[PDB]
Design a protein around this ligand. Structure first.
Ligand SMILES: CC(=O)N[C@@H]1[C@@H](O)[C@H](O[C@@H]2O[C@H](CO)[C@H](O)[C@H](O)[C@H]2O)[C@@H](CO)O[C@@H]1O
Ligand SMILES: [Ca+2]
Length: 142
């Protein structure tokens, strides 16, 4: 399944270069960051992959940002869509608070769009729970 594009609730291109599309390749040294520079978007955070076609998919891969825990996703909702407007929830859960590649698995389902809603996220800042969302890579498989 080829990712045509990634959209997000927001992205940072002013304080550093971290647009949503950085999460659509497997370079572990680049990432999407939610917008943190003023005016910041501090949630809710999400990310939508637009696949080039309808695919039967059953897995999402999440590579955390590798150089910092800011925005690391510890709670998520996965939804799928055929039209990019109406979404169906297929999976909810948590992910461990570390920089390891994560996999989210669910029953096979047709999708052209796959949306990752960030329900929980961590930070190295004391009051930073949920403020940030980052991803070195989000990808889908079938
Ligand atoms: C303990 C502490 O406050 N550390 C901070 C880092 O969080 C901070 O890292 C940046 O934080 C912003 C969001 O505020 C983005 O996530 C950015 O990508 C991070 O580099 C740095 C700021 O350089 O400063 C302290 O170390
Ligand atoms: Ca990347």
């Amino acid at each position: 399944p080829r990712t045509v594009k990634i959209t997000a609730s927001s992205e940072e291109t002013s304080g550093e270069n971290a647009p949503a599309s950085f999460a659509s390749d497997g370079d572990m040294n680049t990432f999407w960051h939610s917008k943190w520079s003023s005016p910041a978007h501090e949630g809710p955070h999400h990310l939508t992959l637009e696949l080039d076609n309808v695919y039967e998919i059953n897995k999402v891969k999440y590579a955390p940002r590798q150089d910092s825990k800011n925005g690391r996703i510890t709670g998520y909702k996965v939804s799928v869509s055929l039209d990019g407007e109406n979404f169906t929830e297929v999976k909810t859960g948590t992910l461990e608070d570390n920089a390891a590649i994560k996999f989210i698995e669910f029953d096979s389902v047709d999708a052209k769009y796959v949306r990752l809603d960030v329900t929980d996220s961590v930070s190295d800042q004391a009051n930073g729970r949920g403020k940030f969302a980052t991803a070195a890579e989000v990808n889908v498989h079938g």
